[PDB]
């Protein structure tokens, strides 16, 4: 399948509390493999996956010094946007960046990303053609003209097509088999009281990786989308994930409902029913 290398960047000013916090977090196929935090006692790039430790001391020193120069660039950027938006030097503000590439099975670039955000709202983004910019407001228009004059879109097309893909394949050689690891969900149904003649049937999916999963409740063969309750997928804390879905059913009609678990680790979708003890 396709692969991706993406970097999530955060720069937060905190006037009166110290220097801005800067973070660089890298993901291979949505999996964190490197992270830089300026608030550490020693600010250095650190591997977040054991398979990144084969990379030599020159790689870590090159990335660390690059992050530190990026941090200075963001410190300047936070001051610039105070002028763009006519904001005071006393407030805290956030700059966020998503940067990276999506690569297909043939090794060719599928999608390139360079997206910015200021205080949680879109600021500017590189368009899918990798030649034009989409600016979200008047302040972003200043950045757009500045970047158009300097050919910045030109500079990222070269990085996204060349540098990003080459690093992604280099990282993939060390961690390709690790990223494909899956853990299938273990599932069961629980039974809970409801007022009067109703009961709740809760279908659990536990200990699965990756996080993508689908849980459905069926009366006969009809999916009960409008009537069920479900929680957002959540981490167990040990690397796996959890999710549940529940429906309120009439008392005595529990055996009329079926739960279905769809996960990429399963040979075929799981089918479950409420099962009372002997």
């Amino acid at each position: 399948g396709p692969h991706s290398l993406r970097y999530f960047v955060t720069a937060v000013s905190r006037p009166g509390l110290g220097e801005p916090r800067y973070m660089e977090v890298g993901y291979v196929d949505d999996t964190e493999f490197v992270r830089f935090d300026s608030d550490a006692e020693n600010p250095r790039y650190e591997p977040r996956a054991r398979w990144m430790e084969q990379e030599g001391p020159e790689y870590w020193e090159r990335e660390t010094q690059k992050a530190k120069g990026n941090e200075q660039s963001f410190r300047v950027d936070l001051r610039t946007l105070l002028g763009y938006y006519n904001q005071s030097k006393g407030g805290s503000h956030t700059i966020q960046v998503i940067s990276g590439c999506e690569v297909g099975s043939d090794g060719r670039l599928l999608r390139g990303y360079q997206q910015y955000a200021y205080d949680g709202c879109d600021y500017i983004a590189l368009n899918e053609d990798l030649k034009t910019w989409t600016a979200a407001d008047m302040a972003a228009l200043i950045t757009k003209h500045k970047w158009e004059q300097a050919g910045e879109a030109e500079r990222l097309r070269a990085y996204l097509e060349g540098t990003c893909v080459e690093w992604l394949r280099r990282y993939l050689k060390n961690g390709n088999a690790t990223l494909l690891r899956t853990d299938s969900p273990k599932a069961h149904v629980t039974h809970h009281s409801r007022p009067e003649d109703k009961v709740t049937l809760r279908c659990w999916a536990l200990g699965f990786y990756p996080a993508d999963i689908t849980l459905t409740w069926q009366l006969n063969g009809e999916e009960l989308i409008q009537d069920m309750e479900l929680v957002e997928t959540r981490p167990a804390g040990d690397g796996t994930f959890q999710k549940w879905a529940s429906v309120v059913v009439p008392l005595g009609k529990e055996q009329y409902y079926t739960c279905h678990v769809y996960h990429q680790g399963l040979p075929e979708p799981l089918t479950l029913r409420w099962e009372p003890p002997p």
Binding site: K66, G69, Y116, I124, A150
Partner: peptide, 8 residues
């Protein structure tokens, strides 16, 4: 390897 960012 993350890109070197350009000023806004």
């Amino acid at each position: 390897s993350i890109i070197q960012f350009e000023h806004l």
